[PDB]
Design a protein around this ligand. Structure first.
Ligand SMILES: OC[C@H]1O[C@H](O[C@H]2[C@H](O)[C@@H](O)[C@@H](O)O[C@@H]2CO)[C@H](O)[C@@H](O)[C@@H]1O
Ligand SMILES: OC[C@H]1O[C@H](O[C@H]2[C@H](O)[C@@H](O)[C@@H](O)O[C@@H]2CO)[C@H](O)[C@@H](O)[C@@H]1O
Lengths: 369, 369
């Protein structure tokens, strides 16, 4: 492959002439020649040549082939700025993400359509089952009902998949409830640091929600850790406060468990419709959420409309920054057992009833049950 | 629980008076009284009472508890219309999805942040490690560096998780390359229907891309199945055509494999920067994509700006309708083996060299090797 040139492969059925024009402008601007080719079976050829360090600088194809190319080490990992990545839909980036790395730029989403001649057939059939009859009608006019590519499985697949054909089954992401990471070295280091703060009287083991809030809001302490709901009381307070990213530990960002405030309907409630009505039509509106939010801030609401408006708040922006650095909380049943286990571990380690090692090791065992 | 009333539980730290006001409006509109309560330990109480068929009509909590509630059969499965579901961010719906069912309405996302008093501390510490020193300084002023709730593990967890603490390890959703669904009854039914169309001379097994396109564009056939790239040639043709949803089979929507045309960069290319420049700055622009699109339509482009403009096209709308009913293609290496397997099966079944059963059974084995 020549340096200071760009060779592009794209399939013949796509607008390679249009791409070539983009190449002409690139050449005009940069003096770098851009050669667009559409070889036969380019998608089969590319691996073969690319293995040998030869072939095009850029290959165009549906993403489905690229995992294979990546796995063979034929694709360079792409590194677009976050700014650029935001310009494309995330699901298209998912298509080109292989083993965590981006391996291609998404370009366009292609799906088969039923294309019909309005002059022969003003209302196309809504079922496949109608087509034989339609064909009978049309054959009497020396026409046929339907013809499409039967050589490529891509074209016949929609009908094959229709009643439950699939390629490979997608396994849901499970949670390993035997993989507990409370007693690993990361947890130990973190908690040890916390215990050390207490030991050096920088913090008091006795501190609870009330004490912490009152101390911060009385301007007795420089900083607190708390969620959106807390802001109301700080606004009440004469304290001029900022809401920011959590501090790093060992150069890693603090990783808060993210909650989704959520409204469940009692299975035993005879008022399910009413519950549905209230939540859907009253609470989950700009007006409803604003009412709650005005009392105590919710944070980043789940309703897109109001959230967009709320996101202007730098406190909410900080909320979301910390959210992204942290993890959404599992909703599995074992979560309560996990919480209880860590609660006890922290308390006992902080109070000095137990060492960090022993406390966490105990939590490990408790959380696993 | 009493019918024709609504009892709501929400934690005391959230804005329950504001919620109550939403309840007052609901009552005004519907005459249904809404009682908002904030019991102590409501999250522990709810399961207890709910088991007995009693408790609030609606329970509010972070999603983390709801899996547990669901598992105990305390929550009614919620059924919002797709229209409503689109109004909330999907990741919040994920939080409330348990064993495939929605079990709660997501309300708002909460994350702990560092809150600091700008008047005491204009620049908050970017690391935990600075805090001891900061505290020393502040104690000499009769203040402390940090105080927060140590009694709830939620507050200490960010530091514990920071350096690699985790609850339970989350296993990413795999693709099972041993679970192949080409020879299931849905695939058999679909392909059988196709073979039957050929057997009844409604279609010719020999029909390929060229033949199909030429036939439709010459107004010889009522319908073809094809992608956006095909439209150019039909516009050229005097044919008056529409682009629509694929027909249903056995009252199921056709499920086309969705491809994302994507551009990968050759790992062996010395021109990687140039490739990056061209793709990012020339192709993936309104202008670049318009150039390609004008030659042969791309469909729904991945670039948000241009896509929004393109979406006005009813052909693209139909494209997206079909896309949503179908599935994005896996990008895994085994995809090529899958395609090859189906290609052969279809050809052999259509040509009549093999029966649908034998062809698909063979494809099954070939796809899983
Ligand atoms: O067939 C033309 C059309 O389909 C393509 O799908 C291919 C797939 O990408 C290949 O790897 C192949 O082995 O099987 C499929 C067709 O059976 C492309 O996805 C698409 O862009 C192209 O226009
Ligand atoms: O702790 C109060 C504050 O955090 C909560 O997180 C809880 C969790 O929800 C509970 O079930 C518990 O066992 O563990 C965590 C605290 O350890 C809520 O998620 C949050 O909204 C609440 O305001």
């Amino acid at each position: 492959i020549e340096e200071g040139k760009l060779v592009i492969w794209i399939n013949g059925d796509k607008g390679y002439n249009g791409l070539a024009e983009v190449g002409k402008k690139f050449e005009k601007d940069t003096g770098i020649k851009v050669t667009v080719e559409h070889p036969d079976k380019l998608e089969e050829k590319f691996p073969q040549v690319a293995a040998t360090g030869d072939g095009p600088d850029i290959i165009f194809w549906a993403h489905d082939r690229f995992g294979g190319y990546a796995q063979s080490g034929l694709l360079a990992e792409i590194t677009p700025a976050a700014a650029f990545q935001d310009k494309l839909y995330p699901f298209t980036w998912d298509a080109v993400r292989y083993n965590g790395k981006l391996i291609a730029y998404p370009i366009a989403v292609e799906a088969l359509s039923l294309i019909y001649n309005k002059d022969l057939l003003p209302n196309p059939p809504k079922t496949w089952e109608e087509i034989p009859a339609l064909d009978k009608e049309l054959k009497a006019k020396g026409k046929s009902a339907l013809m499409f590519n039967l050589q490529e499985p891509y074209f016949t697949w929609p009908l094959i998949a229709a009643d439950g054909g699939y390629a490979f089954k997608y396994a849901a992401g499970k949670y390993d409830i035997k993989d507990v990471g409370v007693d690993n070295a990361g947890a130990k280091a973190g908690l040890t640091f916390l215990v050390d703060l207490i030991k050096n009287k920088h913090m008091n083991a006795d501190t609870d929600y009330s004490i912490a809030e009152a101390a911060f809001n009385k301007g007795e302490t420089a900083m607190t850790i708390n969620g959106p709901w807390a802001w109301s009381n700080i606004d009440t307070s004469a304290v001029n406060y900022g809401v920011t990213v959590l501090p790093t530990f060992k150069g890693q960002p603090s990783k808060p468990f993210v909650g989704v405030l959520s409204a469940g309907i009692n299975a035993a409630s005879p008022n399910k419709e009413l519950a549905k009505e209230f939540l859907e039509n009253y609470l989950l509106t700009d007006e409803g959420l604003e009412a709650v939010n005005k009392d105590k801030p919710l944070g980043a609401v789940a309703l897109k409309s109001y959230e967009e408006e709320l996101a202007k708040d730098p406190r909410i922006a900080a909320t979301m920054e910390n959210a992204q650095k942290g993890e959404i909380m599992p909703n599995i049943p074992q979560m309560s057992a996990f919480w209880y286990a860590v609660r006890t571990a922290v308390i006992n380690a902080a109070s000095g009833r137990q060492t960090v090692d022993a406390a966490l090791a105990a939590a490990q065992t408790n959380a696993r049950e």
